[PDB]
UniProtKB/Swiss-Prot annotation, chains A, B:
N6-acetyllysine PTM positions: K33, K45
Cross-link position per record: Glycyl lysine isopeptide (Lys-Gly) (interchain with G-Cter in SUMO2): K115
Assembly with partners or alone: Homoheptamer arranged in a ring structure. The functional units of these chaperonins consist of heptameric rings of the large subunit Hsp60, which function as a back-to-back double ring. Interacts with 2 heptameric Hsp10 rings to form the symmetrical football complex. Interacts with HRAS. Interacts with ATAD3A. Interacts with ETFBKMT and EEF1AKMT3. Interacts with MFHAS1. (Microbial infection) Interacts with hepatitis B virus/HBV protein X.
Disease per record: Spastic paraplegia 13, autosomal dominant: A form of spastic paraplegia, a neurodegenerative disorder characterized by a slow, gradual, progressive weakness and spasticity of the lower limbs. Rate of progression and the severity of symptoms are quite variable. Initial symptoms may include difficulty with balance, weakness and stiffness in the legs, muscle spasms, and dragging the toes when walking. In some forms of the disorder, bladder symptoms (such as incontinence) may appear, or the weakness and stiffness may spread to other parts of the body.
Subcellular location: Mitochondrion matrix
This protein's name: 60 kDa heat shock protein, mitochondrial
Length: 115, 115
């Protein structure tokens, strides 16, 4: 798939075409929708530019155009070689979600008293 | 002038039309140029939205169009009543610049030892 976090960026209309069962389902869908811009923002923030403007300009662009953070330019990602494995992207998303969303169900935390 | 920090936002091409004498003049001009977006970003950030995207969308819009943070929409600022006094804006800018730019010239700081 496309590299630079653009693959997760191009999956946001597929959440925009989702009907939640109730309001908590809607909250979770919105959480994932806001999370889907995080890798591109982090890559752009490490490059010294404002990540939110970069992500908004990627969203306004065509589906083949992303941000090359080395050149600092908006390019064609397949033609520039900036590509990612599909397995890596889906593995990262699933492994992050399955544990973080269970961490956000907690109400009581029990620890040991430090000796 | 226009309210919401848009008055300072429209004075950035007037810094783009400036020729620095040397590179430190250039550094100071760039400092003021980046500072000129701060009030609009702060007003938008207090409204719970991303200030940088709001400022960029104000940049891309016409000269009469700014952001009503109260209603959260992009409107004609004069026709919607969001206006500022010119004296207040220039007073705030001059009073901030004259002291902050002198604070950024310091190399040694002498304080009293606390008793
Ligand atoms: N020139 C580039 N422009 C834009 N994005 C790029 C560029 N080169 C790599 N990337 C992106 O940066 C990310 C790679 O980051 P990095 O390899 O540091 O971390 P990772 O793959 O998440 O994890 P790990 O630290 O285990 O390697 C990928 O999303 C990749 O598509
Ligand atoms: N509805 C609005 N939409 C957008 N900007 C607005 C709106 N109402 C006011 N503003 C802007 O917000 C700013 C007013 O902020 P505020 O009055 O809290 O602080 P101030 O004038 O900088 O200082 P002080 O705290 O001394 O009053 C002005 O720039 C004004 O144009």
């Amino acid at each position: 798939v496309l590299g630079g976090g653009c693959a997760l960026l191009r999956c946001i209309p597929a959440l925009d075409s989702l009907t939640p069962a109730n309001e908590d389902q809607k909250i979770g869908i919105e959480i994932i929708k806001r999370t889907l811009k995080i890798p591109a923002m982090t890559i752009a923030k490490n490059a010294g530019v404002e990540g939110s403007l970069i992500v908004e300009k990627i969203m306004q662009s065509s589906s083949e155009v992303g941000y090359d953070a080395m050149a600092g330019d908006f390019v064609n990602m397949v033609e520039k070689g900036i590509i990612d494995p599909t397995k890596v992207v889906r593995t990262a998303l699933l492994d992050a979600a399955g544990v973080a969303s269970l961490l956000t169900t907690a109400e009581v935390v029990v620890t040991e008293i430090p000796k």
